[PDB]
RNA sequence: AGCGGCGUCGUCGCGCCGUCUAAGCAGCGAACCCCGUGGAGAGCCGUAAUGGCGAGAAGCGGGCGAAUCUGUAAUGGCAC
């Protein structure tokens, strides 16, 4: 769940941000969508409406950010293609 | 700067006054704010200053939106 994200950011297709994740989920190219625990409830409506598997993240977005490689905060992130990673195995 | 008066004038050519125009009506809209795109971090964008940013910056479009300004009212008043 944690080390897989390192390879998901190293290799494969990923997009950071709520809106681009919405677009990827509606398009369906995003195989899985990863969300932080304390995200606003306004985002969960799409993540349930979208058929994409909903991988929870136990932490908050504040520490989700730095582990993903970005100093800022990450609310909802999608990985379009895993490539050299197995975070999808964590999700499905 | 030009035009019309008044003053001074031992010498010079300066000094002062005037050269106006209401509400109403019609048009335009600076900031803030709202929306559609946009995809920015070993960092970028700004302010007199505080600052803003994947919970979406810069940039690009659209919308709501001031005083005041432009025309008319424009023929009234002036040593017409």
Resolution in A: 2.8
Torsion of CA A47, A49, A52, A55, to 10 degrees: 30
CA of A25 to C1' of B64 (A): 34
Footprint of strand B on the protein (CB under 7 A): A 15-21, 38-40, 61, 70-76
Burial class of residue A13 (count of CB atoms within 10 Å of its CB; 0-12, 13-18, 19+):
middle
Q: 3-class SS at A33? A: strand
Burial class of residue A54 (count of CB atoms within 10 Å of its CB; 0-12, 13-18, 19+):
middle
Instruction: For residue A42, give the nucleotide whose C1' atom is nearest its CA.
Output: B55
- Give chain A's end-to-end CA distance (angstroms, integer): 12
Count Cα atoms within 13 angstroms, Cβ side, for A91: 22
Q: Phi and psi (nearest 5°) for A52? A: -60, 145
């Amino acid at each position: 769940v944690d080390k897989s994200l390192i390879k998901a950011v190293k290799t494969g297709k990923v997009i950071v941000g709520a809106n681009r994740t919405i677009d990827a989920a509606a398009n369906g190219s995003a195989k899985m969508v990863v969300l932080a625990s304390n995200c606003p409830e306004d985002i969960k409506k799409k993540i349930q409406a979208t058929d994409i598997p909903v991988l929870e993240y136990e932490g908050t977005s504040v520490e989700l950010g730095p582990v993903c490689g970005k100093p800022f905060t990450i609310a909802a992130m999608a990985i379009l293609d895993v490539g050299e990673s197995d975070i999808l195995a964590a999700t499905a």
